[PDB]
């Protein structure tokens, strides 16, 4: 279905002598593929997925030069923000950016994104029209007028409609057999007395990729909506993920409950039950 | 500002006696400065690897700490997290059933 | 050099349309500003265009961008005297540093309607016998002679415009250190 | 605004020269560019922050200093003849695509011997009676001769106010000999305007030579930067 | 390829 590219950028100022740390991470279909970190010994963009090994040295050199430019842009911007909010000079402050594009199967731009946050709060964003800005507070109004005056939206619109789209296309072609890879979940149910005559049934899914997955519990053909605990999907650390969902049930009825596991890599959704 | 959510868990199904990896996944925090320790019986473990830090679509940060470990029946393991959102550090103990 | 700008100098007739062109080597360049520099001043941004556009119009100035040829151009319609300046094309990719071409210096010289060439001798009253020669109101297609004699000097054509009314005219000046020099011969 | 200091500089070979730039734009990026016989903008040095600088394309022979956000200087420790050129400072908001805002330029001439620096003699030649009678117009000609180097700006002043209409000045000084340049200009007015004795005409030549920080020995006049004019009144005689 | 910001905040 859809495809996406994003670059997530962070600059964090530090009270000491050090310049802010600037980190940029690129994503294609939610998978990290490049990263730049100013704290590294030799700061440069690096590949973070195998299929990016296809790009030549000019790609990395010029993207690195771009990051260096961004790094200065974020430094200037952070100093401006200190002034806008009349903040004191001995603190730490975070500026973030999210940019990118969503595509259709036919390679049309569905939606472009260019937005910023300061101190974890939305600051300013380019509207879906790619021409106007939504500013969240008084400081952002200053930025908004500067950018309206200098016609900044036209430059971002050009990037989002052109380069973002065109490079995402190229990356998807290069990462075809690599992006399609899946690991199916392996699932099982565990049984945990906790009783006022009750037990927790916990349905586990392990070793799966990508992270997207749905776990359901049911009783006698009905989905169980409430009283069901669902942990955030978590990385195993080896490139696979884990998740569980649990329900509290009456002692003696455990066999009546079934868990279902839906995942892309599967041929069919898994269905399972506590097996004593 | 956002409070870190923490999960402590093993890479592989835990079989006490068998070497494994213990994870401390910390998410949903802002600002990104955070301090994370992993503990064995209340003592800091020295060989702890920190993943690169990333952020989510709500601007909040997340990171994965881990260390090698061989669980036993009596040894306790935990993750201890210090962040500006919280008055005091939060300690979360490893439970093998979660 | 990544931005090639020729010629070094160009003249076009007042009212005509100047076409200035530049080429570039780096096919990834995607922002193309032109800067205009008047004598005695610094350059200033004239007009700019992105790779996604074919043209940008502003008043009588139009930039064209030709991705496939890797060519930029600037068109000035109804070229007038106040447009005579040095024009710099420029080019960059992304946020990389700007690269300037070498600049083309543009002369907009008028079309003198009815030329009545004349030569005059002028005197400096604060001197014993210091004089010079003025060649004025001659045709725009004429070739002002350069000096053949050591000690005598002849200037290039210099066009003035008495905006008071519609009186524009070509002029050249000659002076000398020769004992028997007259303006009769010096301009013929 | 971007303002450069000085406007013109004459220096001895092996002398130290500092060109100054002040910008009021609150811009973080500053640049020094070199232009040669009116062509090129070649980056010498630039700076994106108040205490460091970076090399440009042609940094050799030059150092740069950014003591402040507003200030970026270009330093020639041992000036050479090859550094005779015009230098332009610029500022920009954040580099990359942000517009560069330029100063008006500083012309530098590097000479082996400063005793060759000489101001112009400025002469005003009065209109021909034949032009006045035959064309009802009066062309005044100003001649500046014998100056060195070619750092002159010529202007015309009618009744105390500068005029541009009816003027043509040579765009380039004519070199007569190794250490002697000449420049001409003409101002044309109507015969009736010239014939009015209430009208005052002045040719002014701004010569850029030595500054008051240059030392000069006891005897001869110091060839300092100065305005030198010749003048004439209208007459019906 | 990554975005490139124009005017600063």
PDB file of N, CA and C in Angstrom, chain D residues 36 40 73 76 78 90 102 117 132 137 141 146 157-159 177 181 186 191 194 199 202 205 210 218 235:
ATOM      1  N   UNK D  36      37.950  40.820  -9.607  1.00  0.00           N
ATOM      2  CA  UNK D  36      39.147  41.193 -10.358  1.00  0.00           C
ATOM      3  C   UNK D  36      38.789  41.790 -11.702  1.00  0.00           C
ATOM      4  N   UNK D  40      34.149  38.083 -11.433  1.00  0.00           N
ATOM      5  CA  UNK D  40      34.294  37.129 -10.345  1.00  0.00           C
ATOM      6  C   UNK D  40      33.789  37.619  -8.994  1.00  0.00           C
ATOM      7  N   UNK D  73      36.715  40.673   9.748  1.00  0.00           N
ATOM      8  CA  UNK D  73      37.815  41.387   9.108  1.00  0.00           C
ATOM      9  C   UNK D  73      38.656  40.476   8.221  1.00  0.00           C
ATOM     10  N   UNK D  76      45.692  40.933   5.563  1.00  0.00           N
ATOM     11  CA  UNK D  76      46.792  40.650   4.662  1.00  0.00           C
ATOM     12  C   UNK D  76      48.028  41.010   5.457  1.00  0.00           C
ATOM     13  N   UNK D  78      51.348  40.305   4.875  1.00  0.00           N
ATOM     14  CA  UNK D  78      52.393  40.825   3.986  1.00  0.00           C
ATOM     15  C   UNK D  78      51.796  41.046   2.600  1.00  0.00           C
ATOM     16  N   UNK D  90      29.981  40.228   2.706  1.00  0.00           N
ATOM     17  CA  UNK D  90      28.556  39.915   2.678  1.00  0.00           C
ATOM     18  C   UNK D  90      28.114  39.230   3.959  1.00  0.00           C
ATOM     19  N   UNK D 102      25.423  42.268   0.383  1.00  0.00           N
ATOM     20  CA  UNK D 102      26.798  42.733   0.180  1.00  0.00           C
ATOM     21  C   UNK D 102      27.038  44.172   0.631  1.00  0.00           C
ATOM     22  N   UNK D 117      52.291  57.687  -4.930  1.00  0.00           N
ATOM     23  CA  UNK D 117      50.905  58.099  -4.716  1.00  0.00           C
ATOM     24  C   UNK D 117      50.832  59.603  -4.955  1.00  0.00           C
ATOM     25  N   UNK D 132      27.532  76.348 -28.590  1.00  0.00           N
ATOM     26  CA  UNK D 132      26.458  77.161 -28.062  1.00  0.00           C
ATOM     27  C   UNK D 132      25.644  77.781 -29.207  1.00  0.00           C
ATOM     28  N   UNK D 137      23.522  74.363 -27.027  1.00  0.00           N
ATOM     29  CA  UNK D 137      23.922  73.529 -25.898  1.00  0.00           C
ATOM     30  C   UNK D 137      25.359  73.853 -25.526  1.00  0.00           C
ATOM     31  N   UNK D 141      33.786  70.266 -19.891  1.00  0.00           N
ATOM     32  CA  UNK D 141      34.609  69.079 -19.775  1.00  0.00           C
ATOM     33  C   UNK D 141      35.554  69.215 -18.595  1.00  0.00           C
ATOM     34  N   UNK D 146      47.350  63.101 -13.989  1.00  0.00           N
ATOM     35  CA  UNK D 146      48.565  62.969 -13.192  1.00  0.00           C
ATOM     36  C   UNK D 146      48.389  62.319 -11.838  1.00  0.00           C
ATOM     37  N   UNK D 157      28.537  69.042  -9.655  1.00  0.00           N
ATOM     38  CA  UNK D 157      27.743  69.777  -8.692  1.00  0.00           C
ATOM     39  C   UNK D 157      27.298  71.103  -9.316  1.00  0.00           C
ATOM     40  N   UNK D 158      25.987  71.238  -9.521  1.00  0.00           N
ATOM     41  CA  UNK D 158      25.399  72.446 -10.101  1.00  0.00           C
ATOM     42  C   UNK D 158      24.622  73.163  -9.008  1.00  0.00           C
ATOM     43  N   UNK D 159      25.031  74.397  -8.725  1.00  0.00           N
ATOM     44  CA  UNK D 159      24.404  75.216  -7.698  1.00  0.00           C
ATOM     45  C   UNK D 159      24.354  74.488  -6.353  1.00  0.00           C
ATOM     46  N   UNK D 177      51.192  56.936 -18.218  1.00  0.00           N
ATOM     47  CA  UNK D 177      52.532  56.405 -18.001  1.00  0.00           C
ATOM     48  C   UNK D 177      52.488  55.528 -16.764  1.00  0.00           C
ATOM     49  N   UNK D 181      47.793  58.443 -14.217  1.00  0.00           N
ATOM     50  CA  UNK D 181      46.507  58.179 -14.856  1.00  0.00           C
ATOM     51  C   UNK D 181      45.770  59.488 -15.156  1.00  0.00           C
ATOM     52  N   UNK D 186      32.162  64.800 -18.967  1.00  0.00           N
ATOM     53  CA  UNK D 186      31.527  65.978 -19.514  1.00  0.00           C
ATOM     54  C   UNK D 186      30.115  66.130 -18.996  1.00  0.00           C
ATOM     55  N   UNK D 191      22.311  76.040 -23.711  1.00  0.00           N
ATOM     56  CA  UNK D 191      22.980  77.323 -23.887  1.00  0.00           C
ATOM     57  C   UNK D 191      22.449  78.376 -22.913  1.00  0.00           C
ATOM     58  N   UNK D 194      23.748  77.807 -19.323  1.00  0.00           N
ATOM     59  CA  UNK D 194      25.145  78.233 -19.243  1.00  0.00           C
ATOM     60  C   UNK D 194      25.242  79.755 -19.251  1.00  0.00           C
ATOM     61  N   UNK D 199      24.144  80.609 -12.298  1.00  0.00           N
ATOM     62  CA  UNK D 199      24.469  79.182 -12.265  1.00  0.00           C
ATOM     63  C   UNK D 199      25.951  78.902 -12.012  1.00  0.00           C
ATOM     64  N   UNK D 202      30.550  72.909 -10.854  1.00  0.00           N
ATOM     65  CA  UNK D 202      31.755  72.376 -10.221  1.00  0.00           C
ATOM     66  C   UNK D 202      31.961  70.899 -10.570  1.00  0.00           C
ATOM     67  N   UNK D 205      36.613  65.786  -7.930  1.00  0.00           N
ATOM     68  CA  UNK D 205      37.310  64.504  -7.992  1.00  0.00           C
ATOM     69  C   UNK D 205      37.711  64.068  -6.581  1.00  0.00           C
ATOM     70  N   UNK D 210      46.599  58.068   0.642  1.00  0.00           N
ATOM     71  CA  UNK D 210      47.005  57.664   1.976  1.00  0.00           C
ATOM     72  C   UNK D 210      45.987  58.145   2.990  1.00  0.00           C
ATOM     73  N   UNK D 218      58.784  65.169   6.836  1.00  0.00           N
ATOM     74  CA  UNK D 218      58.557  66.545   7.263  1.00  0.00           C
ATOM     75  C   UNK D 218      58.322  67.501   6.093  1.00  0.00           C
ATOM     76  N   UNK D 235      27.833  82.576 -17.716  1.00  0.00           N
ATOM     77  CA  UNK D 235      28.041  83.950 -18.164  1.00  0.00           C
ATOM     78  C   UNK D 235      27.299  84.212 -19.461  1.00  0.00           C
TER      79      UNK D 235
END
